[PDB]
């Protein structure tokens, strides 16, 4: 008797053929695509899921580049990509994509998940050094 | 290690599920 988030998941895992997945005690579903690109699907809200791409711990040794990331965010804003965000509980960088649930489809979830992957992939290219 | 055989935009080899990247289970609302 599940809300639409929990269907999309099941329907999505059916679409890519990886079996079955679920949401955890903390209302999210973390899977790592190719053991490098970490992604956690959250259903933050009745209206939307968030899509988190985790990019590791965040450097703090001459971290003048926090302003470089903030500068990178210009690119993702023009391109429609995820928001570059910093998170304090794991000191980890994050790509954030909101994903709304009306007119949501397994192919649309699949599409946006890999958007976070190509963002996490291309990130070092979008930066100056 | 799950292999994807989908038409969708995941033309990529495998998915690993996590029970140097944190894979956090929560971020601070407040």
Residue numbers in the entry:
A (entry chain A): 1 to 129
B (entry chain B): 35 to 53, 65 to 75
From the reporting publication:
Enteropathogenic Escherichia coli injects effector proteins into host cells using a type III secretion system (T3SS). The translocated intimin receptor (Tir) is the first effector delivered into host cells and imparts efficient secretion of other effectors. However, it was later reclassified as a multi-cargo chaperone because it interacts with at least 9 other effectors, most of which require CesT for translocation into host cells. We provide evidence that the multi-cargo chaperone CesT binds to two regions in Tir at the N- and C-terminus through a specific recognition motif, and show that CesT binding to the Tir C-terminus is important for host translocation.
Here, we present the co-crystal structure of a C-terminal truncation of CesT in complex with an N-terminal fragment of Tir. The Tir32-80-CesT138 complex produced crystals in the trigonal space-group P322 with one molecule of the complex in the asymmetric unit. Diffraction data were collected to 2.74 Å resolution and the structure was determined by molecular replacement. Residues 130–138 of CesT138, the N-terminal histidine tag, and residues 32–34, 54–64, and 76–80 of Tir were not included in the final model due to poor or absent electron density. Tir residues 35–53 adopt a β-hairpin-like fold and extend the 5-stranded β-sheet core of CesT138, while also being pinched between α1 and orthogonally below by α3 of CesT138. Tir residues 65–75 are bound along the concave surface of the β-sheet core of CesT138. Specifically, Tir residues I38 (purple), L44 (cyan), and L49 (cyan) anchor the β-hairpin-like peptide to CesT138; and L69 plus three additional proline residues make a second point of contact with the β-sheet core of CesT138. Although only one molecule of CesT138 was present in the crystallographic asymmetric unit, the dimer interface is clearly present along the principle 2-fold axis of symmetry. Interestingly, the CesT C-terminus occupies the same binding surface as Tir residues 65–75 (pink), despite significantly different sequences. Taken together, the structural data from the Tir32-80-CesT138 and CsrA-CesT complexes suggest that (i) CesT exists as an unswapped dimer, (ii) the Tir binding region of CesT exhibits significant plasticity that could accommodate the binding of multiple effectors with varying sequences, and (iii) the C-terminal extension of CesT is required for CsrA interaction that in turn could also prevent CesT from binding Tir.
